């Protein structure tokens, strides 16, 4: 259950107009920033404002 909650809705295989494929750049727009290591060590003062 928690692991699905991490994943969210399962992305489709082939890209579609309504939803992007699992390997498309549109789907991985926030994931790339989330998994990037520099998100942890680069900044000196985290911004907690939901911008």
């Amino acid at each position: 259950l928690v692991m699905q909650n991490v994943i969210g809705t399962l992305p489709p295989a082939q890209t579609s107009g309504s939803t992007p494929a699992f390997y498309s750049y549109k789907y991985n727009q926030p994931l790339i920033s989330q998994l990037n290591s520099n998100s942890l060590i680069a900044p000196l003062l985290m911004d907690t404002s939901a911008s």
């Binding site: 489709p12 082939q14 579609s16």
Partner: protein
Amino acid sequence: QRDLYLSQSKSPPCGGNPTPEMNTFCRTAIPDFISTVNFVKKQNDDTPKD
């Protein structure tokens, strides 16, 4: 099975790049099987009309 296939007409094999036999199966409907068995017509075909 064909209904389950047609409900997924965005993914293989009815979608994507089907192999020709799978494409034909996805296209063609299921005819009635009981309706085609008829002994009188078969025997008439086998027997010469003379």
